């Protein structure tokens, strides 16, 4: 692409990583479009170029996050390895569990809301595409014999379970200390994934 | 009689719990638990001095409901029944099980009647330890894979709040709520989590 649109853009993730850090570490609310500016070096009115407000900020980062689970998907192979995408599917969904809890309550502060129609509407599009992408990657496992031949929302919602339970399990004030430098837990919760719903002989 | 005073007390003890489900916890008040039982205010207070000693009763008689279950006291109980048990009794009732996760903010982690919520403290410890004890006895049987306790029970944890969530989601509730089978899938993957391969 031509320099002035690259640099347009790397200007803009550096705002998005620099709010999603501050939104993290100090809590969504308290964080104000001045106080992302300071962070980043620049001054509020160059912030409102990128976007009109927070709630702006917030939904492209939503937005952001389902475009990383659309490429998971997409592989430039003629078969990929099912088993190793429904890994990379629970270690992207489990990996920063402080993000989804976040996304979690933006849920219902602007999507929910629609506080940005435009932006939710997209939203809402992408996220049906990414349904679409687990509920085939699910049945070419069952067609495959390596899923229960259940309705495939077996294994979607035994998923979303798993996952949503998990992130629970790292704001624990008693179990997060306990497992948050266990990369061995972690990797003990993508096996129990990946073979959740697996087919017995 | 003795006899007497518990009937009375487990309706209203019945009696609330199904107004809270209903109708939200902060909403009901005493006085509205009298009027559905029927025994007007007065005799609310000879079993329970408040609202709060209400929430953590149900609390107190939820683990002991646990604590039944792991006491079969058979020599060679089937610990596999038994794992399925646990898992069904975790997961039936979700609006329960949300309703208990306001509780323990309101009235557990405030400690808001201190000698019930000692107690419930006391009978949680019990059933951790019962089911730390069970997963023991599976990995000892080659059943579960060989790692430390904590780890099968913090699955067992996740797939149990998860599952909980999901019933409440506004989409997917319709759905589950009459699919007996998806009911008994999650259960079967409950069971079979953290299976050693053979």
């Known amino acids: 692409e031509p320099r002035k649109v690259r640099e347009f853009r790397r200007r803009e993730q550096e705002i998005l990583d620099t709010a999603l850090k501050l939104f993290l570490e100090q809590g969504e609310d308290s964080v104000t479009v001045e106080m992302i500016a300071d962070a980043v070096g620049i001054g509020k009115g160059t912030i409102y170029k990128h976007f ?4 702006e900020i917030y939904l492209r980062l939503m937005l952001d996050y389902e475009r990383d689970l659309a490429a998971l998907f997409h592989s430039e192979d003629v078969a990929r390895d099912k ?3 429904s890994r990379a599917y629970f270690e992207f969904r489990m990996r920063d569990p402080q993000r989804y809890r976040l996304f979690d309550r933006l849920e219902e502060k602007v999507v929910k809301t629609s506080q940005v129609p435009e932006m939710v509407e997209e939203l809402h599009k992408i996220r049906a595409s990414n349904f679409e992408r687990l ?3 699910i049945k070419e496992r069952i067609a495959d014999g390596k899923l229960e031949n259940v309705p495939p929302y077996f294994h979607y919602c035994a998923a979303w379970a798993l996952v949503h339970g998990a992130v629970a399990l790292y ?3 008693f179990w997060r200390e306990v497992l948050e430098d266990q990369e061995g837990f972690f990797h ?3 096996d129990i994934g990946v073979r959740m719903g697996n087919k017995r002989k």
């Open 52 to 55: 009109k407000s927070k709630a």
């Open 83 to 85: 088993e190793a995408l």
């Open 135 to 137: 509920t085939q990657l």
């Open 171 to 173: 704001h624990s004030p």
């Open 188 to 190: 003990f919760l993508m």
